[PDB]
C-alpha cells in the first residue's frame, strides 16, 4: 500500500534503469528508438528542404 511504499527504501520501489518504476522496459526501448529515428528523419528532412529551396 502507498504508505508502505513510503516506509520502504528505493531498492524495493523502482529499477536501476532510466524509467525504473514508471514504464515497461520494452516501452522504454520503443520510445528511445522512436526518438532517435525521427530526429534523424527531421534532420534529413530539414536539409533536403533547405537545399531544394536554395536551388529555388
Amino acid at each position: 500500500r502507498p504508505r508502505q511504499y513510503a516506509t520502504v527504501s528505493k531498492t524495493h520501489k523502482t529499477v536501476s534503469r532510466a524509467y525504473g518504476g514508471s514504464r515497461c522496459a520494452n516501452c522504454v526501448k520503443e520510445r528511445i528508438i522512436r526518438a532517435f529515428l525521427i530526429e534523424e528523419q527531421k534532420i534529413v528532412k530539414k536539409v533536403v528542404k533547405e537545399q531544394t529551396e536554395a536551388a529555388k
Partner: protein, 96 residues
C-alpha cells in the same frame, strides 16, 4: 509478376523471414534485399530503413499485408518482412 519471382527465389535462392533473423543478416551484411509489408509498424519500418541505409542494401515495399506476403512466399503465417540473401535465378535484384 512479383509473387512469381518470389516463389522462384523460394525455390532457387535463399532467404530469411521475420525481423530478428532479417536484421541479424543485415548486421552481417550477408543480405541484399528486403521486402517489407505495408501493415507492419512504422517504427519497425523506419528502423529497417535505417539499417538498410547503413548496409547499402535494397528495399522494396509490398502492396499487401503480412498475410499476402506469406501466401506469396508459400508459407501460411504472418510475414511483415523478408530478407533475400541471393536469388540465383530471378531478376529480383535487377528489376525495381
Amino acid at each position: 509478376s512479383i509473387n512469381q519471382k518470389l516463389a522462384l527465389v523460394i525455390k532457387s535462392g535463399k532467404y530469411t523471414l521475420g525481423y530478428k533473423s532479417t536484421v541479424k543478416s543485415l548486421r552481417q551484411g550477408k543480405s541484399k534485399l528486403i521486402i517489407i509489408a505495408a501493415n507492419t509498424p512504422v517504427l519497425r519500418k523506419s528502423e529497417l530503413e535505417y539499417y538498410a541505409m547503413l548496409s547499402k542494401t535494397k528495399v522494396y515495399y509490398f502492396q499487401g499485408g503480412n498475410n499476402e506476403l506469406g501466401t506469396a512466399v508459400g508459407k501460411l503465417f504472418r510475414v511483415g518482412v523478408v530478407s533475400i540473401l541471393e536469388a540465383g535465378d530471378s531478376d529480383i535484384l535487377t528489376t525495381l
